[PDB]
Design a protein around this nucleic acid. Sequence first.
RNA 1: GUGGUAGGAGGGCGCGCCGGCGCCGCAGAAGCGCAUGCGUGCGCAUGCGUGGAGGCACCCGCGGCGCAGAUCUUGGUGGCAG
RNA 2: GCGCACAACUGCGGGCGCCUAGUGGGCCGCCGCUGGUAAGCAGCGCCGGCAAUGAGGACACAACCUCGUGCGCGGGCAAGGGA
RNA 3: GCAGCCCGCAGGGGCGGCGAAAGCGUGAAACCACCGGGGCGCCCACUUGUGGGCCCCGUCUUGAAACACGGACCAAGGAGUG
Lengths: 121, 104, 325, 247, 179
Amino acid sequence: EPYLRVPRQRKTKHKFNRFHSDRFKRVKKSWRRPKGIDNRVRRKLSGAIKMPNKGYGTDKLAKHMVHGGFRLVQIRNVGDLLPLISQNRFYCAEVAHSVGAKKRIEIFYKAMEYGIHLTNG
Amino acid sequence: FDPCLTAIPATFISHMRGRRIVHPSHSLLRIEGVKTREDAKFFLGNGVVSLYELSGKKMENRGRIRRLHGNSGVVAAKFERNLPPNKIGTEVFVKLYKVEDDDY
Amino acid sequence: DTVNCYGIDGETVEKQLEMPDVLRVPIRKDLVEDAFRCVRMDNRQPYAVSPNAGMQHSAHSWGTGRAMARVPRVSGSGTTRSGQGAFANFCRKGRLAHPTKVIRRWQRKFNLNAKRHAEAMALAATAIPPLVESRGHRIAGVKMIPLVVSNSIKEIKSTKEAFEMLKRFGLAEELARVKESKCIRAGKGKMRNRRYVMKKGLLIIYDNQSDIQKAFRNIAGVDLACVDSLSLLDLCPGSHLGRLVMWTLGAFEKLNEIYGQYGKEAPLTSGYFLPTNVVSKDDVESLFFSDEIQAFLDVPNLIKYEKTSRKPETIESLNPYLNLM
Amino acid sequence: SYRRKMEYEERMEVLSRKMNEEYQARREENARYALQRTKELIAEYKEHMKKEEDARREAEARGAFYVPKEPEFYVVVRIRGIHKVPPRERKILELIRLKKPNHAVFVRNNAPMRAMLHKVRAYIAFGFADIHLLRTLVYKRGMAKVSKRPLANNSSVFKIGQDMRLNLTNEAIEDHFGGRIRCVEELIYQIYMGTDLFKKANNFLWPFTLCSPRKGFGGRKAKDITQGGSTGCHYDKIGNLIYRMIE
Amino acid sequence: IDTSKLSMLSRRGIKVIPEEAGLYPSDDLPAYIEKLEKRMQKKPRVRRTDLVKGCIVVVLEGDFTARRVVFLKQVENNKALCCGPAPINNVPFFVIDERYLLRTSTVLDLKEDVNIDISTVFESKRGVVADRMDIDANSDQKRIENAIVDAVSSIRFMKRYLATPFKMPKFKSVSSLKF
RNA sequence: GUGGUAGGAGGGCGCGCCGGCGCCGCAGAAGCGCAUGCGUGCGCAUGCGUGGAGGCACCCGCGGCGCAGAUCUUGGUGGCAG
RNA sequence: GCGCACAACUGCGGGCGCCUAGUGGGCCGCCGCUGGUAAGCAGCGCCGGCAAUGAGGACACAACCUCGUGCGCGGGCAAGGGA
RNA sequence: GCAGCCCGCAGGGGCGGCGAAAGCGUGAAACCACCGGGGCGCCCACUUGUGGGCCCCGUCUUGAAACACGGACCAAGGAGUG
Ligand SMILES: [Mg+2]
Ligand SMILES: [Mg+2]
Ligand SMILES: [Mg+2]
Ligand SMILES: [Mg+2]
Ligand SMILES: [Mg+2]
Ligand SMILES: [Mg+2]
Ligand SMILES: [Mg+2]
Ligand SMILES: [Mg+2]
Ligand SMILES: [Mg+2]
Ligand SMILES: [Mg+2]
Ligand SMILES: [Mg+2]
Ligand SMILES: [Mg+2]
Ligand SMILES: [Mg+2]
Ligand SMILES: [Mg+2]
Ligand SMILES: [Mg+2]
Ligand SMILES: [Mg+2]
Ligand SMILES: [Mg+2]
Ligand SMILES: [Mg+2]
Ligand SMILES: [Mg+2]
Ligand SMILES: [Mg+2]
Ligand SMILES: [Mg+2]
Ligand SMILES: [Mg+2]
């Protein structure tokens, strides 16, 4: 189904939760680089969790790819379907969340006319 | 089809490891009757299968004997999926045909 | 480059004017943005907290020894406020640290000559039809850009005739786009007397001899500005060049008086000269392909080499002469 | 306007295809020349070695003792790591271009270079390579230190601080030495017989990023080989380390 | 006048959902994937020179998978034509992978040409024990089967050999694993 | 070529509001809960549920703009403890 | 002014200016010392380290030994080991 | 936007009733009841229960897991500005 099959190639299945976000509910899981003087994650001691680096970054051309080779496109109305008509195979289209059900009907019908794959429907 | 009909059983004894750090992609196997390093050269490149059950459904995890290990016929094998440390002490079956590092 | 002057008929060409030299100025988009930033904070009104705010207590630190933090506590007893923390920015009902003052510098100074250049370049942006449609103006129906209407624009008395006049100038889709774009603002600005936002439509620039203020100010999508005082808030609203501007003939013919011609002082603005660019031609990167430059060039190295390898089998294979001895 | 851009791009398109075909025909003519010139110089290597053996056996036909002229270069391998090095010894390993362990270079058999090798002899293993160790080191792990030249017709304008580590092709040698040397064996000959082109030939070789040796160093590698280590003058037995280090 | 530097940023075209991501790599992604798929392109596999026409071999991984058969011909895409003769051991003609044949030392004296109409022969894959349809018309397969029934009749115990399923030799050394 | 405290720098993510510019919403907005996806990461997008009227994106501009700590402040709640 | 001329080896781009932070409790090892009965004491010199240097080996272990350190994969090893 | 019926001395409960819904908007977290599922606190590996790696963060300090100090939990607020 994609034009070119891009493998997933995320360099780790790690999530990089924040340090001690397991132990404290005040510490949310969004990553903060720990800056303490004795902190075992900053010091990169063995047994500590890993910190995000440049090295974990996925490939430039594989980045932000969905369903193999596709790239997501936000759609708010039927006018957004028109620049996707020529490039059907490159983009999976996604209707925005705040689009109402009346306009989602008209997006859904024009997308199957223009042959655009909708991830919402 | 019994695995012991055509394949030689080998016990999964350890992962390839340091004293503490363990590299689980390479599994150390002790083939029965193989007791020296030159005896285990007969099994370099040979395919190996680890047979297990997931929810009662039989699975084959296939691998390749990659390198020798030590002077006592222990060989290191790399499988499709890494062997769990639960299966240490259980048997895996060493095939009599060579497979390649790309194609198990 | 000569522009037509239309009647209120909207189709008959009355005069054929030359383009004023203001509208041929090469636009320095950074300079118009730099001036727009300081012009926007000319009507910036002050805000501050009250100088008493949070400081209206007799609060003192209780000191150490009471197993409580050293923050000032509200004096007295018998109320829930008593003994609670005061005066600090981290305290509830405390004074915010670094309270806002009205002595903040609300306005920003900009050099008058540099502001006049940016007014000139924002004027030249209105004369470029790729710019005007790029900032959202629907200018398919409009005749020319720059659209200049005759000085018989002042004979329109009622705004029904003025709306009809803009209709036969092809601005009907432009005005209808602005009128339907009226929606409620998306923040807390709707509480602060800024409830409705609508888009910016046509700007009509006039002079004192063609005063069309009454007949045109109520049309949604029409702004009116005298030619003697053009702000950048009209010419690039939102720091986005290319406002759709309809000129009267009186305002258009005064552009060579307010800004003058090239190399000459402006007659109506004392000591103003139109800006001089650092380049003469347009699109100076295309000068690279001129034969004067192209003859000058040395020959670049276009040999596409193979990617090097470091593995010892490949670099033995490049020079396979090790085994010959 | 838009015409003069497009007629430029097809003018560079022709010029790219023309000088790339010229570059490939240079590569084939160089490789055809290189195959001849290796066989010519290998015969010269055999003739030089046969002349020394004939000089040596004729001396023991009489009572005499003949040792030949010792080679015009040392081969030096960095044994110790980059840590805890005093500033004099750290500087000498920089001027020998030995910036990591298991790196190998050739240094000239000079009196100043012998004193440099002596002061860092607790960090290096050095000795004498014969022609087989010289040719194995260059043909199996030999890269060129090449400065970029942005203009084809003008080789005088180039970049100073940035030197690329590229393959030791014939054309890289022909560009550095201005037509004087144009094959790898002809570069060996300036190393082997220590010509006036030695300093240019040796510096054109990137330092040999060797592997750590097979079967180990066999003990405590930091001490001297006179005490059982691997660190010092391996006088002509330096191939016993380096041949294990190449692959 | 080039308006592209002068103009406001036009977002009317394509709103990719991570706006840090570009439109689509219409140029650079073909070169990246062709480099990528050639990198995980597995190596060209060596065809072994060990098997000779009429060499008795035991299949290790197939539908049959412990059956002494005889080897006929090496086929394309790394396959090998084999037939432990269907009168003797109830094994039809098949092709498997070249490697799954463990080579035994004894070779039959088969002189017949083995260039058979392989287009419809049942190919036994590795793990599947999928129940294939029964025996077919066998135009030339009946002739070359009878030639190795002719070959097996000359050698005394060879009929029992090809009928008996393979048992692993009792391991004592790797010298004992010679076959 | 790739460690990094104090430290400096760059580029982004995020928040309130501004001038614009593209839009969305009673056929259900923000917010919230649970999922899925994207993302080295800051974070983002969607699905379902809830909700019942606003909101989003980008470019700009202003800033009381990002919290685990301060015997922090205020509020709520535990264990202790039937 | 004319004429002559590129100077041991090896390596390699270099010179200078401006603004500003942090720091100004150090500690340890080697070798060399001073005071002291000595000290995991006190005070120096040179170099290296920790501080700020992870990882491997030292049973654990700021400094010892190896050795530096993006994210992985494959190989070969170091120190150190191989009931 | 109620009190019809059954029960209760009653508070009320249950069947109902009004309304688009809410029933003095939304209703996060801490925390709790019950139910369902599962038993590393985290990271890695896989065949998910095993192995390997991990002392408590912040901080001052030559040096912190420290028998150094602050921190029960959670939300909100909270500090280089004019
Ligand atoms: Mg207050
Ligand atoms: Mg808001
Ligand atoms: Mg770094
Ligand atoms: Mg820092
Ligand atoms: Mg917002
Ligand atoms: Mg956002
Ligand atoms: Mg604040
Ligand atoms: Mg908090
Ligand atoms: Mg903190
Ligand atoms: Mg309590
Ligand atoms: Mg001391
Ligand atoms: Mg270290
Ligand atoms: Mg350590
Ligand atoms: Mg350790
Ligand atoms: Mg080894
Ligand atoms: Mg409520
Ligand atoms: Mg400190
Ligand atoms: Mg202390
Ligand atoms: Mg600490
Ligand atoms: Mg203690
Ligand atoms: Mg406490
Ligand atoms: Mg907060």
